[PDB]
Amino acid sequence: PEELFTKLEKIGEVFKGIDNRTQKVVAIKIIDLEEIEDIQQEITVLSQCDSPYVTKYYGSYLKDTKLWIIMEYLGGGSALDLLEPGPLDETQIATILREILKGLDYLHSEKKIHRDIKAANVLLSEHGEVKLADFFVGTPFWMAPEVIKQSAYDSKADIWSLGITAIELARGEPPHSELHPMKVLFLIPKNNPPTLEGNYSKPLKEFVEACLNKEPSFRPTAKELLKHKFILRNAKKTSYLTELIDRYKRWKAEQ
Ligand SMILES: [Hg+2]
Ligand SMILES: [Hg+2]
C-alpha cells in the first residue's frame, strides 16, 4: 500500500519517514478519517503552493481509513522551539523575519493569505532554512483587529500578525500572553496597538510599529518590509541560524 515510505519515530499523528525511492526524509501526517472538510481544504492549498519558503507537499494517500499526507521534513524545530533556551539577538530576529517576509511575499503575490503567522508556524531545516507552515480564523494573540471583528480583510492581516511575531521573536511571547484568550479578543480591537518595549534598536521598534497599524492600508506590504532598515542592517546568512538550532538541541538534552 503505502510502502513507498518507511515510517520512523513519531515527531493526527506526525512521523519522520523515508522515501524508499530516493532515501530522502519526509514528514508523514496520518489522520484517521473515521470534520474532513477542513483537512480537505488544507491539502488543496498546499498542493497549490510551490515555494522554497513554504513547506512542500509531496502527496496524499489513503490506506484503509487512514490518510497519509507526505510533507517536507524540517528538523531544525520551529522558531518557537528556538526561543525556549533564551533570547534571540537582533541578527537572528532580522534573518528569521526576512525569510518569513519572502514567504509572505510569495503567498501574497499568489493571492493567498496565511492567516496564522506566529513563531510556532515558522519551521527551520537542520541547515537553518526558514519556511512557513500550517495553512474568523487564526490564533487570537496574533490576529489582526479586522480579523477579530469578522470585518473584511486581505493579506494586510498577515502583516499585523508579522508584527506580533516580531514582538514574540524579540520578547519570547506575544502581547497579552498572560490573559485569557477571550479577554484578548476584546482588547485587540479596543486598545491602542502593541509596541515593542525594552532595550531594542530603533529600527526594530519601528519595524514593529509599522506592522502594527490598526488601519490595514497603512501597513506596508511584505515586499516593502524586505527593504526596511531593520531587515537591511541586521539580516545575515540563514546558515548562521545553525547556532540557534544547536543551542536548542543542547538545551533540550539537559531537560
Ligand atoms: Hg500554501
Ligand atoms: Hg500557494
Q: Are residues 152 and 67 in the same domain?
A: no
250 Cα: distance to centroid of ligand 2 (angstroms): 35
CA–centroid distance, 253 to ligand 1, in Å, is: 33
Dist. CA 186–CA 102, nearest whole Å: 31
CB contact burial 128-161 (16+ within 10 A = b; e otherwise): bbbbbbbeeebbbbbbbbbbbeeeebebbbbbbb
- Regarding whether 89 and 6 lie in a shared domain, the answer is no
Q: Which ligand is nearest to the CA of 111?
A: 2
Enter the DSSP assignment of 238. G
Would you give the DSSP letter of residue 1? -
Domains identified in the chain, total number = 2
Q: Give the ligand with the smallest distance to the CA of 114.
A: 1
Ligand sitting nearest the alpha carbon of 49: 2
Residues 44 and 80 in one domain: no
Round to whole Å and give the CA distance between 187 and 50.
37
- CA 46, 51, 54, 60 dihedral sign is positive
In the block, cell 481509513 appears at 65
**Resolution of the solved structure (Å):** 2.0
Same domain, 120 and 172: yes
Q: Identify the domain containing residue 236 by its residue range.
A: 74-255
Q: State the DSSP string of 159-226.
A: HHHHHHHHHHHHHSS-TTTTS-HHHHHHHHHHSPPP---SS--HHHHHHHHHH--SSGGGSPPHHHHT
Rounded distance from Cα 224 to ligand 1 centre (Å) = 21
Do residues 208 and 96 both lie within one domain? yes
Q: Which is the catalytic residue, given 50, 116, 154, 246?
A: 116
Using the mean position of ligand 2's atoms as its centre, give its distance from the Cα of residue 191 in Å.
Answer: 33
Same domain assignment for residues 47 and 128: no
Residues comprising the binding site? 11-14, 29, 72-74, 121, 134
58 and 183 in a single domain? The answer is no
β-bridge pairing 77-78 and 122-124:
antiparallel
Q: Mark whether 78 and 122 lie in a shared domain.
A: yes
116 is catalytic: yes
